[PDB]
């Protein structure tokens, strides 16, 4: 398989069969069993949340540049916008909501039985995933039954994080750019395409 | 504001602490020609003084009843640039140093003559460890959680 | 006006009631639990002290519950203390609230 | 040449090289970023 | 089971009524400590269950505030009551006297019991309806515990609200909630 | 006592090497020796010596 | 007048008696270590407190211990 640098010298704690593996652990970060079985899930949730953030950042500024809506900028949407409720109330409500889901995910990470629902739904309300790691299922998470077979989801499970890493670096780019240019990201890109050899890092 | 100190860009005692120093520098300057090394050095010093005094007022430090900045090492959000912001980077650097030193000791200790590798450093291994010592918190906390950080059979004795 | 002869007698009577009636088994069991001061394993009197001897000629009583004179002294002292603590307070009038 | 590298791997020589590099770094920083009392971040 | 799937300690095997396995700090590790803790929890639960109506009723009927209903001290007079008629024998010293004496006698009576079962479940003249004779009993204990813990939490909420919002009671706070649920909430004292 | 080349940990309360490990050299098997076990350590003491003899009941952890 | 003591850990190095510059320590037959030798301090009335004895015994802590006691003319090392 290909590695990050062609002078490979690949590490031992990660050998193969892992989705999106390129032997990139130069700083020996996860070398212990718990460390790897935890960092896989960490990278998964990070990739997914950053993909969601990218999908919520691009579309808005793109359509606003091409003239479709009058929504505010990403670094201005949450920034002092009285829209429906008090922002702090929404923050507290979001924390109380995310608690009941992050606790379930934690439970399944540490002791992988959490599929059955509650409130007298002990019957036909089981989550039918049964995966190796934190990949849920059931109509509540995987309605269309796309994750069909094991030992050949590696293309799709690879695509997931190969897009999530790009989304993560894209999000960091969004933050740093909109912090140092004080301008929209697609506005930055257009002003760059105006004359590339003059619009660079200061 | 806090602690009965006024901001420095309004302190009527900072103006004197600036103009007196400026006038002293000019009195020194008037002993040469405007095209000689002492005059150039003194003009550079004056420009540096102006650039220094036109930065404290813009930052937001609070001056005293004598026209001197005072650091509010309290946790005040309006003053994080005085203690906690530099303190965090210092703690980062110091943890880096300590972690890479500890790791070098741990690695050297399992060798043939470990005492030889402490008066004669082996630069390849030391450099490797210094490089890997960038993510030291994610490693120190991981060694704490995994029970690899401390010993239990210490060799202290007292009769 | 704060009358005294009734308030301090009510305080003393209340604390004497408390001592003789409601706290007497508790007090007796707690005294018997930690009985005698002991040095090096044996009490002061047996370690040798003509002045560490209890006075039973002062403790011989007849109350059905064993209410000796020192119990009366202690509970009445507490009664007078609470009575005067009440007396001294209700003579000023103040407003030290929230 | 090997013994030369071993000698350069001694404690005083590495100490003085490290401290001189650090002194140069700090001196350059202070010549370019002078009179730093508050972190502007 | 306060955490579906999580195991239980060696002392929280679920035999006791109202037992779910909650002990993250490891307090009940010692047997006699746990035996005292159970009785203490039952006492606190019963006191809070008694207290909750005692605060919720007189604000809507006797028109008090449960913190001004105790304010009538430091000012001669007060001593309001249910209809509002002043209780003539409600002078602070002579009322604190009996408030002390009666409760002292009651507690010094309850304290004298060797049996832990009879300690936290006396019966006799305290069950003068045959509610626990031979019928469903563990279920009754479970209902009692489940209501008592809820009452404890409710009273803690009472005491924190009366401090966050001074000079008011926990019933006008419901009207404040239902005046604007999305602006009037805990996110004001937490995030000022 | 213990085997040769065995790694044992000391229990002598007044030893420099208390709670430290060392490999046995050769335990003398005479009838009347009071401290037959001989162990050498990889760290000298304040006097500079690294070998010392103990009794078999005075050091064992394996 | 100082008090010398020889605990039963002497391996018979004989260095204690070689070092003592007062003829205080002497060897004695005592089976048990390797060579049936042990130290002995019969002439403690002459020890000055030199502690050269303790600086020689290569035992774990020590096997010969000097305790400084009452001072006299011999122990003070005086020549006047
Ligand atoms: C990060 C972040 C996450 C994971 C969420 C997620 C959520 N938001 Mg939220 N939000 C987040 C930042 C922000 N939100 C909002 C504005 C809103 C609004 C107006 C609403 C939410 C709602 C919700 C909830 C939808 C169910 C859920 C807890 C909804 C909700 O809370 O319904 C109960 C809702 O109505 N968010 C702004 C502005 C944010 C950033 O500044
Ligand atoms: C983690 C994901 C995430 C988060 C936190 C947000 C957060 C937000 N979005 Mg958003 N969005 C997302 C993903 C996300 N978006 C995606 C994937 C799409 C597609 C959109 C499309 C979208 C639109 C079209 C609008 C928002 C708006 C908003 C703001 C108010 C939300 C309410 O209503 C808030 C800052 C609204 C807003 O305030 O304007 C920017 C709004 O009009 N979003
Ligand atoms: C994810 C990939 C990605 C892509 C396609 C871009 C693309 C771009 N970045 Mg960028 N950036 C990224 C990640 C990315 N960035 C990350 C991860 C960071 C954090 C270090 C930054 C920090 C950054 C800065 C600080 C600046 C850019 C700027 C720019 C623009 C000019 C090209 C340049 O200077 O570089 C261009 C649109 C520059 C600009 O002004 O945009 C016009 C600019 O000043 N970027
Ligand atoms: C723990 C002690 C301590 C601490 C916290 C500091 C902290 C600081 N010193 Mg300082 N200093 C110290 C001991 C210390 N020094 C000692 C012992 C000496 C004597 C050798 C000096 C001599 C010294 C000089 C000559 C200068 C500083 C400067 C500075 C500032 C660093 C600005 C920079 O380079 O970025 C900073 C406030 C520089 C500065 O600009 O101060 C504001 C500067 O010019 N210090
Ligand atoms: C938990 C025990 C408890 C305690 C300590 C109190 C204590 C008190 N209650 Mg109360 N109460 C309780 C339970 C309790 N209540 C319950 C369970 C109910 C529901 C039936 C009530 C209903 C109630 C009303 C309706 C009123 C009080 C009032 C009072 C106060 C006046 C006492 C008085 O003169 O009456 C005791 C005198 C003779 C028995 C006093 C602070 C009065 C008050 O504060 O007015 C503002 C008042 O009006 N209580
Ligand atoms: C939700 C309210 C609630 C419930 C369901 C129970 C339930 C119970 N209590 Mg109970 N109790 C409560 C509130 C409650 N208590 C309060 C507020 C006080 C004060 C007491 C004081 C009390 C005593 C003193 C005794 C009970 C006893 C009992 C048991 C049998 C009597 C019965 O069911 O009635 C049963 C487990 C009896 C028992 O367990 O025996 C008993 O002796 N309770
Ligand atoms: C027992 C359950 C319970 C219930 C039903 C309530 C209900 C309420 N609380 Mg509350 N509270 C509780 C327990 C409870 N509390 C506990 C245990 C605490 C201590 C942590 C608090 C601390 C608390 C604060 C600090 C505040 C509330 C507030 C409120 C009100 C705002 C509505 C809301 O989102 O909540 C509402 C009437 C808020 C309020 O009164 O605003 C209207 C408010 O500021 N509560
Ligand atoms: C998840 C993430 C970003 C998520 C962003 C989100 C949700 C954005 C949300 C919002 O926009 C919306 C939705 C709407 C706005 O109104 C509100 C906000 C809130 C603004 C970034 C991850 C960002 C993660 C990043 C950048 C990670 C970079 C890692 C790199 C480069 C390498 C790391 C290493 O681990 C390796 C690989 C090997 C080791 O040996 C060496 C090291 C270095 C340790
Ligand atoms: C916040 C704040 C504050 C406070 C502070 C405090 C109060 C602190 C505390 C602290 C503490 C109380 C501490 C603790 C301690 C610790 C411990 C107990 C541990 C130890 C440590 C360790 C172990 C480490 C390790 C290491 C590393 C990591 C690196 C290298 C080196 C070493 C190895 C050493 C102030 C006001 C000032 C200011 C503002 C902010
Ligand atoms: C015989 C009898 C009887 C009777 C009894 C009696 C009658 C009793 C009484 C009692 C009493 C009558 C008591 C009293 C006591 C008292 C006391 C004991 C006192 C003390 C006091 C004090 C100690 C004080 C102090 C002080 C001072 C001095 C000053 C100021 C401060 C004070 C206050 C602190 C009866 C009927 C029951 C029964 C039968 C038998
Ligand atoms: C940007 C810029 C600048 C700046 C610079 C920089 C970038 C630097 C930073 C850095 C810094 C600015 C740092 C420093 C700071 C520090 C501080 C200010 C600290 C102090 C404090 C302390 C140190 C204290 C002490 C203590 C005590 C008292 C006790 C014990 C502990 C301790 C030791 C901590 C300038 C002006 C040039 C110009 C313009 C641009």
């Amino acid at each position: 398989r290909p590695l990050w640098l062609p002078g490979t010298t690949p590490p031992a704690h990660l050998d193969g069969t892992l989705a999106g593996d390129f032997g990139f652990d130069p700083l020996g970060l996860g070398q212990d069993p718990q460390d790897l079985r935890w960092y896989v899930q960490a990278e998964l949730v990070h990739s997914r949340f950053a993909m969601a953030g990218v999908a919520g950042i691009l579309f808005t500024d793109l359509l606003r540049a091409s003239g479709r809506t009058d929504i505010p900028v990403w670094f201005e949407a949450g920034a002092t916008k009285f829209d429906f409720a008090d922002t702090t109330t929404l923050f507290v409500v979001q924390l109380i909501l995310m608690g009941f889901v992050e606790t379930k995910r934690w439970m399944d990470i540490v002791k992988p039985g959490s599929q059955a629902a509650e409130d007298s739904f002990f019957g036909f309300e089981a989550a039918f995933e049964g995966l190796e790691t934190g990949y849920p299922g059931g109509p509540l998470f995987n309605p269309l039954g796309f994750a069909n077979d094991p030992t050949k989801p590696q293309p799709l499970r690879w695509k997931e994080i190969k897009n999530g890493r790009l989304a993560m670096v894209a999000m960091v780019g969004f933050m740093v750019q909109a912090y140092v240019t004080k301008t929209g990201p697609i506005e930055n890109l257009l002003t760059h395409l105006s004359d590339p050899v003059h619009n660079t890092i200061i | 504001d806090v602690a009965g100190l006024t901001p420095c860009k309004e302190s009527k005692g900072f103006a004197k602490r600036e103009k007196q120093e400026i006038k002293k520098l000019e009195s020194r300057l008037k002993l040469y020609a405007p095209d000689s090394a002492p005059a150039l050095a003194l003009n550079a010093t004056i420009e540096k003084t102006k650039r220094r005094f036109a930065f404290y007022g813009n930052e937001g430090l609070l001056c005293g009843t004598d026209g001197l900045p005072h650091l509010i090492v309290d946790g005040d959000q309006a003053h994080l640039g005085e203690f906690v912001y530099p303190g965090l980077v210092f703690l980062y650097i110091a943890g880096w140093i300590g972690w890479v030193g500890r790791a070098y000791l741990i690695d050297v200790r399992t060798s043939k003559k470990p005492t030889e590798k402490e008066i004669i450093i082996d630069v390849p291994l030391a450099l490797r460890i210094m490089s890997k010592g960038l993510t030291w918190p994610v490693a120190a906390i991981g060694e704490l959680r995994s029970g690899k950080l401390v010993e239990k059979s210490a060799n202290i004795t007292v009769s | 006006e704060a009358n005294t002869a009734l308030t301090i007698t009510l305080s003393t009577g209340a604390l004497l009631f408390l001592g003789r009636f409601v706290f007497l088994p508790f007090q007796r069991d707690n005294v018997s639990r930690q009985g005698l001061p002991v040095q090096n394993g044996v009490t002061h009197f047996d370690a040798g002290d003509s002045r560490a001897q209890e006075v039973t000629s002062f403790l011989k009583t007849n109350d059905p519950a064993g209410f000796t004179i020192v119990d009366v002294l202690a509970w009445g002292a507490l009664g007078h203390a609470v009575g005067f603590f009440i007396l001294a307070t209700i003579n000023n009038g103040y407003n030290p609230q929230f | 040449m090997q013994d030369v590298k071993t000698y350069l791997s001694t404690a005083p020589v590495l100490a003085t090289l490290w401290f001189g590099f650090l002194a140069g770094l700090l001196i350059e920083i202070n010549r370019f970023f002078p009179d730093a009392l508050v972190l502007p971040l | 089971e306060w955490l579906p799937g999580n195991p239980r300690p060696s002392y929280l095997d679920g035999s006791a009524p109202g037992d779910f396995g909650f002990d993250p700090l490891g307090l009940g590790e010692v047997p006699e400590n746990l035996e005292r803790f159970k009785e203490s929890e039952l006492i606190h639960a019963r006191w809070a269950m008694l207290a909750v109506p005692g605060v919720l009723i007189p604000e809507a009927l006797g028109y008090g505030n449960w913190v001004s209903a105790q304010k009538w001290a430091a000012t001669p007079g007060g001593q309001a009551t249910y209809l509002g008629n002043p209780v003539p024998w409600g002078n602070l010293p002579v009322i604190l006297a009996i408030e002390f004496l009666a409760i002292a006698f009651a507690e010094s009576q309850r304290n004298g019991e060797p049996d832990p079962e009879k300690r936290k479940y006396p019966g006799g003249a305290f069950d003068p309806l045959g509610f626990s004779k031979g019928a469903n009993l563990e279920e009754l204990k479970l209902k009692e515990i489940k209501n008592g813990r809820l009452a404890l939490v409710a009273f803690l909420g009472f005491a924190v609200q009366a401090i966050a919002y001074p000079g008011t009671g926990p019933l006008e706070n419901l009207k404040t909630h239902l005046a604007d649920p999305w602006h009037n909430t805990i996110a004001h004292v937490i995030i000022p | 006592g213990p085997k040769r080349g065995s790694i044992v940990k000391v229990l002598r309360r007044e030893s420099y090497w208390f709670n430290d490990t060392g490999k046995v050299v050769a335990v003398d098997q005479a009838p009347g020796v009071r401290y037959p076990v001989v162990v050498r350590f990889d760290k000298v003491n304040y006097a500079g010596v690294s070998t010392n003899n103990y009794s078999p009941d005075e050091l064992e952890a394996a | 007048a100082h008090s010398v003591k020889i605990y039963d850990t002497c391996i018979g190095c004989t260095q204690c008696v070689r070092a003592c510059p007062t003829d205080v320590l002497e060897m004695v037959p005592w089976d048990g270590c390797k060579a049936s030798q042990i130290a002995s301090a019969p002439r403690t009335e002459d020890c000055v407190g030199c502690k050269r004895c303790e600086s020689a015994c290569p035992t774990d802590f020590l096997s010969v211990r000097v305790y400084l006691g009452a001072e006299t003319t011999r122990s003070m090392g005086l020549a006047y």
Side-chain angles (χ1 to χ4, degrees), chain A residues 1-72 74-202, chain B residues 1-11 13-159, chain C, chain D, chain E, chain F, chain G:
Chain A
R1 73 153 178 264
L3 296 205
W4 62 296
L5 87 172
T8 79
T9 309
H13 50 282
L14 72 183
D15 48 20
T17 63
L18 257 175
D21 191 339
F22 290 115
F24 177 51
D25 198 16
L27 293 204
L29 213 35
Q31 294 264 15
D32 304 323
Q34 206 263 352
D35 276 317
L36 186 48
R37 69 102 177 154
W38 180 261
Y39 296 167
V40 178
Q41 308 276 268
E43 185 188 26
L44 269 186
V45 289
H46 261 286
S47 317
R48 294 179 176 155
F49 264 130
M51 282 193 279
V54 149
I57 282 195
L58 274 321
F59 287 169
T60 56
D61 273 316
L62 171 67
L63 66 84
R64 186 227 36 78
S66 51
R68 179 169 315 250
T69 327
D70 201 2
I71 55 201
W74 83 265
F75 73 122
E76 206 69 32
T80 76
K81 181 50 190 67
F82 272 150
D83 44 4
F84 159 66
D86 209 329
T87 56
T88 45
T89 297
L90 274 163
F91 182 65
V92 152
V93 163
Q94 144 202 284
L95 280 164
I96 305 285
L97 254 342
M98 286 274 305
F100 202 81
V101 10
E102 293 303 88
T103 38
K104 295 287 282 192
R105 202 182 97 241
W106 203 342
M107 186 45 208
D108 210 313
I109 285 176
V110 56
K111 289 165 292 290
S114 188
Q115 289 90 331
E118 307 88 1
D119 352 301
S120 281
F121 301 158
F122 286 146
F124 47 94
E125 210 53 42
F128 306 109
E129 39 263 46
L131 277 299
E132 202 172 293
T133 70
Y135 289 94
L140 212 71
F141 292 128
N142 185 30
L144 313 183
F146 274 158
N148 45 327
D149 84 88
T151 76
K152 259 302 296 202
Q154 200 137 340
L156 207 47
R157 285 172 142 180
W158 264 53
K159 287 147 160 182
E160 206 196 10
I161 55 186
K162 257 212 215 168
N163 292 259
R165 300 164 187 178
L166 173 59
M168 289 192 272
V169 280
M171 288 288 331
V172 186
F174 285 136
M175 303 188 66
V176 162
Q177 251 118 225
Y179 180 81
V180 86
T181 77
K182 285 86 44 185
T183 329
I186 307 197
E187 290 191 310
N188 265 342
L189 157 68
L190 294 183
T191 298
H192 177 79
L193 292 213
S194 88
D195 42 274
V197 277
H198 260 296
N199 30 70
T200 176
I201 322 296
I202 302 320
Chain B
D1 196 318
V2 46
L5 315 149
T6 89
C8 281
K9 74 185 184 315
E10 295 90 342
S11 177
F14 221 53
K16 303 135 54 62
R17 288 239 168 251
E18 210 200 69
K19 63 190 293 294
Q20 283 184 158
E21 192 142 2
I22 286 291
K23 282 302 113 201
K24 176 78 149 295
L25 281 165
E26 309 285 13
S27 57
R28 273 192 66 185
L29 173 58
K30 68 183 168 74
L31 262 44
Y32 317 89
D35 38 348
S36 32
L40 289 130
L42 273 152
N43 297 314
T45 301
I46 293 166
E47 212 284 330
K48 195 188 168 175
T49 292
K50 302 185 315 141
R51 275 264 185 168
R52 152 168 89 241
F53 274 95
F55 158 81
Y56 289 168
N58 322 332
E59 277 330 289
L61 304 119
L62 306 176
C63 279
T65 188
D66 50 326
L68 284 179
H70 288 352
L71 306 201
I72 313 280
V73 296
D74 196 7
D76 200 346
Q77 297 226 323
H79 290 315
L80 307 176
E82 296 154 22
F83 191 68
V84 290
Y85 274 157
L88 281 179
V89 15
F90 161 76
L91 267 188
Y92 190 57
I93 305 185
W96 194 326
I97 303 167
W99 192 249
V100 306
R102 165 174 199 287
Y104 180 82
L105 281 188
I106 295 288
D107 191 325
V108 150
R109 211 190 286 130
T110 180
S111 91
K112 327 301 168 314
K113 291 155 77 165
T115 82
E116 182 188 358
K117 277 189 157 183
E118 285 181 11
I119 65 179
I120 301 292
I121 325 283
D122 41 300
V123 180
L125 181 85
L127 273 201
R128 172 179 331 148
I129 306 185
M130 290 173 53
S131 67
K132 292 165 48 200
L134 176 122
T135 56
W136 69 266
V138 203
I141 293 189
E143 271 215 347
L144 180 80
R145 269 271 164 115
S146 34
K148 290 298 119 202
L149 189 56
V150 317
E151 262 290 352
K152 292 307 290 276
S153 64
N155 33 299
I156 187 62
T157 177
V158 274
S159 172
Chain C
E1 170 79 339
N3 181 14
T4 92
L6 93 166
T7 176
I8 115 167
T9 194
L10 261 281
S11 164
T12 45
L15 261 150
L16 252 332
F17 204 113
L18 225 66
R20 168 63 159 82
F21 285 118
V22 318
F23 282 125
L24 209 47
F26 182 70
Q27 141 71 8
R28 287 315 188 209
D29 199 10
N30 257 277
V31 162
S32 189
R33 261 186 174 170
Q34 32 173 355
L36 272 306
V38 151
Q39 40 154 104
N40 273 25
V42 61
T43 87
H44 293 3
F45 197 6
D46 310 4
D49 263 278
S50 33
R51 313 168 175 96
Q53 172 157 44
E54 310 209 1
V55 295
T56 77
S57 320
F58 215 61
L59 269 275
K60 219 269 296 180
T61 187
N62 300 72
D63 181 52
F67 210 54
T68 164
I69 185 60
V70 300
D71 303 9
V72 190
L73 272 169
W75 289 103
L78 249 57
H80 272 81
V82 188
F84 265 107
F85 178 73
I86 294 177
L87 253 192
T89 281
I90 78 181
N91 283 120
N92 327 98
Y94 278 140
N95 59 276
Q97 75 277 324
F98 200 106
Chain D
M1 193 59 208
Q2 167 183 143
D3 301 69
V4 179
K5 285 140 61 197
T6 297
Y7 168 60
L8 290 190
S9 273
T10 326
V13 202
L14 287 198
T16 178
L17 285 159
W18 194 243
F19 287 142
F21 165 75
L22 190 73
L25 176 71
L26 267 310
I27 282 159
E28 291 326 271
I29 293 186
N30 287 110
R31 193 199 53 185
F32 279 132
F33 296 81
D35 314 357
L37 196 47
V38 43
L39 185 42
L41 184 94
Chain E
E1 289 70 18
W2 75 287
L3 178 47
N6 213 40
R8 299 175 138 171
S10 42
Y11 36 94
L12 263 274
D13 57 339
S15 88
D19 193 309
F20 302 141
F22 186 47
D23 198 355
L25 267 166
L27 289 181
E29 190 95 5
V30 238
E32 67 281 287
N33 282 35
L34 190 63
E35 199 33 72
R36 163 187 188 86
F37 282 154
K38 291 189 193 171
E39 169 224 340
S40 191
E41 170 184 34
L42 255 194
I43 297 306
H44 289 83
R46 294 177 185 161
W47 274 108
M49 283 201 259
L50 245 191
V52 166
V55 62
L56 297 191
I57 282 298
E59 184 188 347
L61 278 295
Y63 304 159
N65 195 272
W66 102 267
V67 308
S68 76
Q70 334 163 12
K71 188 79 161 185
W72 57 264
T75 316
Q79 69 267 357
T81 321
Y82 323 123
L83 206 54
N85 3 34
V87 43
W89 65 100
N91 189 359
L92 192 128
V94 288
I95 200 47
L96 196 168
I98 45 176
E99 197 254 32
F100 185 100
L101 187 132
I103 300 295
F105 176 53
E107 296 274 332
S108 34
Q109 285 288 273
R110 170 176 67 89
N111 167 54
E113 176 72 31
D115 194 358
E117 301 325 280
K118 291 290 209 306
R119 171 175 303 272
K120 32 177 177 284
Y121 299 118
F126 298 105
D127 196 3
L129 281 182
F131 257 81
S132 59
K133 42 177 184 180
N136 58 325
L137 190 35
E138 288 278 349
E139 310 82 321
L140 272 177
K141 298 181 189 296
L142 190 87
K143 298 177 165 175
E144 172 187 53
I145 271 290
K146 273 204 175 198
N147 291 263
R149 290 162 174 168
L150 172 67
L152 286 177
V153 176
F155 199 87
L156 195 55
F158 286 161
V160 188
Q161 289 156 52
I163 274 300
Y165 292 159
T168 204
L171 273 173
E172 316 105 344
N173 306 149
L174 216 80
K175 320 307 283 186
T176 316
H177 209 118
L178 274 311
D180 215 26
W182 311 101
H183 266 45
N184 294 319
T185 205
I186 321 104
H188 187 15
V189 47
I190 287 287
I191 349 197
Chain F
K3 297 172 289 304
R4 268 202 203 87
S6 181
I7 295 282
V8 304
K9 157 180 136 184
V10 196
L11 305 155
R12 195 184 272 199
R13 210 65 160 103
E14 75 289 347
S15 195
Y16 183 93
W17 295 277
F18 180 72
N19 283 159
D20 256 306
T21 89
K23 55 157 290 192
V24 198
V25 182
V27 44
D28 201 327
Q29 290 275 87
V33 173
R34 308 158 181 249
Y35 308 89
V37 191
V38 193
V39 45
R40 174 193 49 98
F41 304 92
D42 34 10
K43 37 182 314 198
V44 305
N45 60 340
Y46 292 129
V49 296
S50 46
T51 304
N52 195 69
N53 34 43
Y54 302 77
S55 100
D57 46 330
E58 209 165 19
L59 82 176
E60 182 44 80
Chain G
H2 306 160
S3 272
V4 202
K5 297 290 174 185
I6 301 98
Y7 301 86
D8 61 5
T9 43
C10 204
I11 61 187
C13 36
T14 74
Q15 306 292 350
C16 330
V17 352
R18 286 189 189 278
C20 211
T22 330
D23 193 295
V24 168
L25 295 160
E26 68 170 46
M27 270 296 130
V28 128
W30 165 82
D31 82 311
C33 55
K34 173 79 183 301
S36 47
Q37 314 185 32
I38 209 191
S40 172
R43 265 103 51 192
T44 83
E45 91 259 16
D46 284 6
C47 206
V48 304
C50 47
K51 302 254 188 165
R52 291 197 200 174
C53 356
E54 306 187 20
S55 316
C57 216
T59 319
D60 201 338
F61 171 44
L62 263 185
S63 57
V64 44
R65 210 69 170 99
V66 196
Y67 303 97
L68 298 185
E71 210 89 62
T72 89
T73 282
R74 295 190 209 185
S75 45
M76 203 67 119
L78 295 174
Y80 55 88

